[PDB]
Write a protein that binds this ligand. Structure first.
Ligand SMILES: *[C@@H]1O[C@H](CO)[C@@H](O[C@@H]2O[C@H](CO)[C@@H](O[C@@H]3O[C@H](CO)[C@@H](O)[C@H](O[C@@H]4O[C@H](CO)[C@@H](O)[C@H](O)[C@@H]4O)[C@@H]3O)[C@H](O)[C@H]2NC(C)=O)[C@H](O)[C@H]1NC(C)=O
Ligand SMILES: *[C@@H]1O[C@H](CO)[C@@H](O[C@@H]2O[C@H](CO)[C@@H](O)[C@H](O)[C@H]2NC(C)=O)[C@H](O)[C@H]1NC(C)=O
Length: 203
């Protein structure tokens, strides 16, 4: 499994290409999607284009721009995700720079990149740890956070953070549940009021 981004100019047309290799019996459920100028919340719902497949080994999304304009100026990302597996792929960022234009980042770090040896890798989405770091040509692999853990922010973390448990013994209970992207909150039990803050315990 991997993901790569590239581009082809043919005529005045410019083609942006997201290419993903995935195991064949992963194909059913699979989405690949290109977003422009996200804040690390590439989702299908927010993508310029998307492609969804069902089979029952490579998949490629192309996004064609007939003529390049300052409207096309920006940073793009190719992303993909498996619906059965939950696994998500984060392509390398690349930006169209209109000036006549140039495309960059095809092939220190950016906001939404983290550092890894001699490269800068795409961060994983909220609610996802880094399964596998990016290589030169290939982007980052992300796995969803397992139940009991979370990460709220775009990240390059290899373990998810442990959601805080609340001690029933202290008149604490979860006022907000633990989801993959949100930590739990401890509030007070029925008819209890808080006395130590952080609540650490209730009366
Ligand atoms: C993204 O992922 C793609 C699918 O995984 C990948 O395409 C595969 O690439 C691998 C590695 O290049 C290919 O494996 C080679 O296959 C031939 C047999 O057909 C082998 O000759 C070759 O072995 C090489 O030489 C030695 C003896 O074989 C071996 O010991 C070495 O390890 C060496 O690699 C490889 O085993 C495979 O055919 C591809 N699979 C398919 C389905 O096409 C893309 O390269 C990858 N893209 C990027 C940018 O990483
Ligand atoms: C975390 O999940 C559980 C199970 O869905 C929620 O359980 C609720 O708890 C309240 C208060 O104890 C009870 O009245 C009900 O039995 C449950 N209500 C509902 C609507 O499911 C628990 O409260 C969840 N936490 C939050 C903040 O949603």
């Amino acid at each position: 499994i991997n993901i790569t981004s590239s581009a082809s100019q043919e005529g005045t047309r410019l083609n942006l290409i997201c290419t993903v290799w995935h195991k064949k019996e992963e194909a059913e459920g699979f989405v690949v999607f290109l977003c422009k100028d996200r804040s690390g919340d590439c989702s299908p719902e927010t993508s310029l284009k998307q492609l969804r497949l069902k089979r029952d080994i490579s998949s490629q999304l192309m996004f064609t721009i007939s003529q390049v304009t300052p409207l096309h100026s920006g940073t793009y990302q190719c992303c993909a995700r498996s619906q059965k597996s939950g696994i998500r792929l984060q392509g390398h960022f690349f930006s169209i720079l209109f000036t006549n234009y140039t495309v960059t980042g095809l092939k220190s770090c950016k906001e939404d990149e983290y550092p890894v040896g001699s490269e800068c890798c795409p961060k994983c989405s909220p609610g996802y740890r880094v399964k596998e770091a990016c290589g030169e040509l290939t982007g980052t692999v992300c796995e969803p956070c397992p139940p009991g853990t979370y990460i709220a922010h775009l990240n390059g973390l290899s373990k998810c953070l442990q959601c805080q448990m609340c001690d029933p013994a202290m008149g604490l209970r979860a006022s907000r549940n633990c989801s993959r992207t949100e930590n739990a909150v401890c509030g007070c039990s029925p008819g209890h009021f808080c006395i130590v803050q952080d609540c650490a315990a209730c009366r």
